[PDB]
Design an enzyme around this catalytic site. Structure first.
Site, PDB file in Angstrom:
ATOM      1  N   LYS B 157       0.825  -1.203   0.000  1.00  0.00           N
ATOM      2  CA  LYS B 157       0.000   0.000   0.000  1.00  0.00           C
ATOM      3  C   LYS B 157       0.861   1.256   0.000  1.00  0.00           C
ATOM      4  CE  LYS B 157      -2.954   0.206   3.298  1.00  0.00           C
ATOM      5  NZ  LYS B 157      -3.213   0.316   4.758  1.00  0.00           N
ATOM      6  N   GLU B 183      -2.582   7.160  13.135  1.00  0.00           N
ATOM      7  CA  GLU B 183      -1.723   6.081  12.679  1.00  0.00           C
ATOM      8  C   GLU B 183      -0.724   5.695  13.756  1.00  0.00           C
ATOM      9  OE1 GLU B 183      -1.650   4.179  10.025  1.00  0.00           O
ATOM     10  OE2 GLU B 183      -3.492   5.114   9.308  1.00  0.00           O
ATOM     11  N   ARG B 184      -0.266   4.449  13.674  1.00  0.00           N
ATOM     12  CA  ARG B 184       0.886   4.034  14.455  1.00  0.00           C
ATOM     13  C   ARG B 184       2.080   4.897  14.082  1.00  0.00           C
ATOM     14  NH1 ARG B 184      -2.474   0.599  12.500  1.00  0.00           N
ATOM     15  NH2 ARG B 184      -3.118  -1.305  13.595  1.00  0.00           N
TER      16      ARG B 184
END
Ligand SMILES: Nc1ncnc2c1ncn2[C@@H]1O[C@H](COP(=O)(O)OP(=O)(O)OP(=O)(O)O)[C@@H](O)[C@H]1O
Ligand SMILES: [Mg+2]
Lengths: 498, 466, 44, 468
Positions: B157, B183-184
């Site tokens: 991705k 997000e992480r």
């Protein structure tokens, strides 16, 4: 040395929550002292959470039965902090840094504040150095690297604590400092965990931060953040372990679902509005604060790392619940332990079909990365053909040998408890299994086979293990030097045994 | 214009201002800290007598109940311009990268802006030319449209994002924006920064053509709520210039979650499963600024994470209400060395109708995904019949399906320095012609693995001739 | 014999569908009750 | 002291005291109530200028606002020592048996005490033979550890508890404590009295070595809430002096449900399905006192009632993490006339360890779980397609699994009232040998119906020979 301190009066003390009336100019997470009075010779601290107009609602870090209406509270200027450093290694301490094993005072010089901002956005680095769990299933299919937070999610009794303790025990000489935060866990079980750590000599690098179930919900609420601060100090400053400045920490939160329960209790006792399943609205924020502090810093900021292993119990294997989904979203990978697999003999009980590790091969040694691809592919393909295995008996010889190899590989992972396997041993076993050297062995003996094989390498040929370990980082692990003297060792073992 | 903090409950700060100088509903509070920096809050509810309830945007672990607060009059002002390009920013627009602060000469724009009016909207949908065969054939984008990838990690991705940025920057001017919402920090940062800095095109790194705004999970709910609007403002600056913008809102769902928390702490009455009552309006105020006007178009390709696997959940449903295309990255395709893991099935797009793309584009896109409509259901039959040795005609269909599945793969320019294979940019007309001619049978002479990583059917032929 | 076996299997599948429908309806009612209870608690 | 009642909301009484004489958090206040008998409430919360919220632990349905309340200044004090042996007490420590009240010389200990510290924890445990095949094989009853059975309404929790007490109460080697929190006064007690007084240990009855605190279903929420703590206080004295204690608490759930009702009347913000926000802390405070320390050991056996049949209910879910051995009783097994009703796959134990329980016992238990796990994996295939579609070895495993399910059933000596089967006591060695023989293949020819209500494998073989 007289000083002026801000004083308030406890106007309402309840189930561990006190309204502190006038404590103006109090910091939003200070430590109110509750100085000793007649009948209590010690101080019971508290965390001033809600700073409302004309009120300070503070959770109590201890037993609230002693606090009485009208008691004076002095606001210590320090935000909630926990002692950190070399002195905490091998000590069981409650989340306030006070020892509870009674082995003496905690010798420390620095107190790091809990509830700290994340290490940074650009300060991190790609996770490359693996964390050797010692479990073949984890180390081959769901790798854990230094700086990667990997959830351990399962049912009530499937082996989550067993997996965490195996990971902690395996870090004997790998330059790792383990931390075991026991949130809401019964004191007898924490004592059993400490006894297991001491028995295998894993209490020279382990810190146990236990807030048991009897202790107030505030202590359980701050139980992981203390300990996370300990690991932050370890990755940022390092500790002298075995004469080496170790800057790698591996923190295991014993049960984050119990931490969420404690947060729900302290929030509902503060009369904050509930959310889904009566949990407060910002509990995803609660766990994201804690888990995002586990990072692999770059060389400019020290190069240290903090590895988090949260543990979650799911009711009736409902991984769609609120807290399980929140922590699954937060973490970088999941280890699913199932009771169905645990009862069927698969002792590690990992559901490798749904267990995922987003870091992937970057969290594996080049030897393990080279060998485990075939393992993962064959296991997935065996899971695919399980449909034909359950019903069809007319499958061709190719599918029969294929399913047989799948069963070989599944029986390879049936590791016992408290018997971790180093990286070279797992690599040797996986090479033996994946290169068809194990096809003739019937399934029920494979585990025994593996064990016996290792004894062979521990007695007949230690040099092959040393060679495998020495060059496990090369781009192409099956070096002709490595390929020989290992296939030779496997063939020699085949003749000796059966 | 200076008030005093009254209450502090978590990340919700109540502040009393003078009677005639109450801040507006979206102004910044900007609490000054002792150590030089400031804590910028965002008003959310005017109430009482000069009292405003605001979201912290920060920790609020060192604030008393008497600290002064300096209303800024305007909403959160974010730097916009060519200066804010190739840099990483937080929700407040402060550059969090190693380089220095943004100069005072750079224009600051309000975070909250009105989406374009109805008159400016395009009266006909237009396809967005990405250059990827599977994307431009199965699930075409929309100029000023929304696309969601449903894929985990290890499916490429990030490489798809990098190639989309590179292609838009090469074929068009194509500046890009990336908002990592919830997000992480490991995945979102230092694994997107390093991969895009390493990835290069026309001796220019992808990171040099991309703006980044990162509101990660560690930040309070307000930061994750307004990081998307920050990225929208930064992209809208370039859109006003007429340049085409590609915006990646990574985990738009984490935006919704943020709002939920912001509501729960704000005392708002819960809706559905704990979600905020203002769900549809909050999502509209973000998804309506992503549209194709006459001057320029902000095309968006978002990422959606569904809790468990529930598409019935209010957050995924609200996201899907504003989506034009879905791209389903799959593990099986990725592990088969097919670099673009886009699944030919489960990847839809409302543009795929003969009125917009064209009759030939629709016809071939229905011809393909029809031999795979069964997903080669023959594969189940092959498993217990061995093809009955061979199928009367099905065996051909299997060959065509395998060939086209291999042909969906394409060498990417961003990966050109990794796999040592030049990147191929394939126009939509080339893709439709290639797949149509392959389905006629021209592709029945070449063996498989000759379609493995080649841009056009003509490129496959050149290889067969040589 | 195959016809008889499939008739028995279809009857068993229909009985299992009825049981699963009862369980699903119980779960649906429980979910609605839980949702309204938590919404009323949040409102109050 | 000398406060006045302001509000009476259910069993929760709010009382206003002088400003400088407010009772502490867990102090006990008393309403004179007239008639020479007083109502003892326990403070729970302090609300402000001398206002305290307490739990009545009594009828609290005939007293008015403005009644005076006297502050004792100490929490509930219950008698401890040998004087409490062989007597039946309330939550307040007042005897309800016909014998006279406990003398003043007997020590009074508060019912609210700190649980044993981390140093005092004793992690040494060993198998406790109970004579029940499923319990001694799948989830061994633990000596010096915490164990419990989680059963629904219709399953036989009471029968299992009574059988356990009958089996292990004669050879106690110490005293015992039974707490009847929220249980029927028909069977839960007053027929355990009949059985305990009938049992004789060398001219001393089992009842002469038992302290029984009741607080059953009829009592208001406060009594059911604090009866467990009273029983724990009476047992901690015997543990502290070294005497081994067999502790039998009944329906720990009922303890939690009462806490829920008390919290609902106290105005606390409800959590989950109406439960108290302080569920985990209350469970911890009660359970961490049930621990074997380095001074003495408490062999605790608990019961837990699951509401409806939901094992995901907050009360059993909280109990599950406080046990060494878990025994899950399922209604589906019970409706199959399998009266032990224990689900082997949902029952675990910590001492099921080859070092602790023995290599053969461990192997037999693991195999008896792997079988019936293969059965649970094939329940739907058998349900729809039928037995024929399975492979030969799968058919064999399913047949052995159903035989094992029937064989786990066992008649109980206390079940003669409604079942004609005489009771059977199967030692752990006999159970292990029987199941090992069953797994080897011996008994394959025997029909499954001959495994129902039997002892060891020899009884099954004898029944088969009798049937020829
Ligand atoms: N090889 C093995 N690997 C893992 N667990 C095992 C293994 N062999 C036995 N076990 C079981 O795992 C238990 C260890 O505790 P476990 O890790 O399952 O606790 P847990 O998941 O934290 O559960 P709880 O909520 O009950 O504390 C042992 O007592 C035993 O029942
Ligand atoms: Mg555990």
């Amino acid at each position: 040395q007289p000083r002026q301190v801000n004083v308030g009066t406890v106007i309402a003390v309840g189930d561990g929550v006190a309204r502190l009336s006038g404590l103006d100019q109090v910091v939003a997470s200070e430590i109110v002292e509750f100085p000793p009075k007649a009948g209590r010779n010690e101080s019971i601290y508290g965390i001033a959470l809600n700073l409302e107009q004309d009120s300070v609602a503070a959770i109590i870090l201890g037993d609230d039965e002693t606090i009485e209406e009208g008691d004076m509270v002095t606001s210590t200027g320090r935000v909630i902090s926990v002692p950190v450093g070399q002195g905490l290694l091998g000590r069981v301490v409650n989340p306030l840094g006070q020892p509870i094993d009674g082995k003496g005072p905690i010798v420390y010089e620095k107190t790091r504040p809990i509830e700290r901002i994340a290490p940074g956005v650009i300060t991190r680095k790609s996770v490359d150095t693996p964390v050797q769990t010692g479990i073949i299933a984890i180390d081959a299919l769901i790798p854990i690297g230094r700086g990667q937070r990997e959830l351990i999610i399962g049912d009530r009794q499937t082996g989550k604590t067993a997996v965490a303790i195996d990971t902690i025990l395996n870090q004997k000489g790998q330059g790792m400092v383990c931390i075991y935060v026991a949130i809401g866990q019964r004191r007898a079980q924490v004592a059993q965990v400490v006894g297991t750590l001491e028995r295998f000599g894993a209490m020279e690098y382990t810190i146990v931060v236990s807030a048991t179930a009897s202790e107030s919900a505030a202590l359980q609420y701050i139980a992981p953040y203390a300990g996370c601060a300990m690991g932050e100090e370890i990755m940022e400053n390092g500790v002298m372990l075995n004469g080496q400045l170790v800057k790698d920490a591996l923190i295991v939160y014993d049960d984050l679902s119990k931490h969420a329960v404690a947060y729900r209790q302290v929030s509902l006792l503060l009369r904050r509005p509930p959310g889904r399943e009566a949990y407060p609205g910002d509990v995803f924020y609660l766990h994201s604060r804690l888990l995002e502090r586990a990072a692999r810093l770059n060389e400019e900021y020290g190069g240290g790392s903090l590895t988090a292993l949260p543990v979650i119990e799911t009711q009736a294997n409902d991984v769609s619940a609120y807290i399980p989904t929140n922590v699954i979203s937060i973490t970088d990978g999941q280890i699913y332990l199932e009771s169905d697999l645990f009862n069927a003999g698969q002792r590690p009980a990992l559901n490798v079909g749904i267990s995922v590790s987003r870091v992937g091969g970057a969290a594996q040694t080049r030897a393990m990365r080279a060998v485990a691809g075939k393992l993962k592919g064959e296991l997935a393909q065996f899971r695919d053909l399980a449909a034909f295995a359950q019903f069809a008996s007319d499958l061709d010889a190719t599918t029969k040998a294929q399913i047989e190899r799948g069963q070989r590989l599944q029986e390879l992972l049936k590791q016992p408890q408290y018997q971790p396997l180093p990286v070279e041993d797992q690599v040797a076993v996986l090479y033996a299994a994946t290169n068809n050297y194990l096809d003739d062995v019937p399934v029920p003996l494979i585990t025994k086979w593996r064990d016996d094989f290792l004894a062979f390498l521990r007695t007949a040929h230690p040099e092959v293990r040393k060679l495998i370990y020495d060059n496990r980082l090369d781009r192409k692990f099956p070096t002709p030097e490595v390929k020989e003297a290992l296939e030779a060792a496997i063939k020699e073992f085949k003749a000796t045994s059966n | 214009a200076k008030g005093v903090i009254q209450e502090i409950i978590g990340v919700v700060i109540r502040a009393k201002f003078p009677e005639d100088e109450v801040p507006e509903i979206y102004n910044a509070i900007e609490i000054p800290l002792g150590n030089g920096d400031r804590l910028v809050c965002e008003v959310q509810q005017q109430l009482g007598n000069g009292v405003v309830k605001a979201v912290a945007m920060g920790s609020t672990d060192g604030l008393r109940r008497g600290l002064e607060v300096i209303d800024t009059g305007r909403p959160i002002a974010v730097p916009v311009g060519p200066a804010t390009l190739g840099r990483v920013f937080n929700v407040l627009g402060d550059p969090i990268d190693g380089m220095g602060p943004i100069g005072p000469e750079v224009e600051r724009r309000p975070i909250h802006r009105d989406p374009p009016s109805f008159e400016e909207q395009n009266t006909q949908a237009q396809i967005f030319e990405t250059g990827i065969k599977v994307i431009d054939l199965i699930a075409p984008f929309t100029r000023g449209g929304k696309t969601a990838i449903f894929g985990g990690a290890g499916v490429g991705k990030t490489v798809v994002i990098q190639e989309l940025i590179a292609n838009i920057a090469k074929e068009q001017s194509g500046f890009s924006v990336f908002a990592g919402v919830g997000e992480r920090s490991r995945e979102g940062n230092d694994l997107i920064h390093e991969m895009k800095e390493a990835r290069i095109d026309e001796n220019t790194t992808v990171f040099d053509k991309t703006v980044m705004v990162f509101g990660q999970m560690n930040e309070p709910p307000g930061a994750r709520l307004r990081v998307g609007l920050t990225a929208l403002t930064m992209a809208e600056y370039f859109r006003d210039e007429g340049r085409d913008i590609l915006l990646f809102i990574d985990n738009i769902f984490r935006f919704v979650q943020a709002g939920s928390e912001v509501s729960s702490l704000l005392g708002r009455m819960p809706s559905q499963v704990g979600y905020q009552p203002t769900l549809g309006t909050e999502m509209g105020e973000l998804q309506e600024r992503i549209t194709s006007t006459k001057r320029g178009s902000i095309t968006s390709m978002q990422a959606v994470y569904v809790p468990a696997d529930d598409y019935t959940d209010p957050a995924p449903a609200t996201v899907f209400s504003h989506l034009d295309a879905t791209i389903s990255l799959e593990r099986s395709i990725a592990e088969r060395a097919i670099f673009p893991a886009v699944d030919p099935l489960a990847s839809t797009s409302r543009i795929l109708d003969p009125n917009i793309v064209g009759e030939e584009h629709y016809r071939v896109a229905q011809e393909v995904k029809r031999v795979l409509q069964r997903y080669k259901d023959l594969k189940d039959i092959i498993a217990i019949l061995g093809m009955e040795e061979l199928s009367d005609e099905d065996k051909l269909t299997v060959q065509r399906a395998r060939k086209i599945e291999l042909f969906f793969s394409q060498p990417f320019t961003v990966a050109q320095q990794f796999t040592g294979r030049p990147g191929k940019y394939v126009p939509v007309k080339k893709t439709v012609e290639s797949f149509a001619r392959l389905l006629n049978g021209e592709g029945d002479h070449i063996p498989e693995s000759f379609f493995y990583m080649q841009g056009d059917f003509d490129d496959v032929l050149a290889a067969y001739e040589a | 014999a195959r016809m008889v076996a499939m008739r028995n299997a279809t009857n068993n599948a229909k009985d299992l569908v009825r049981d699963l429908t009862l369980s699903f309806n119980k779960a649906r009612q429980a979910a609605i009750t839980k949702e309204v209870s938590e919404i009323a608690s949040g409102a109050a």
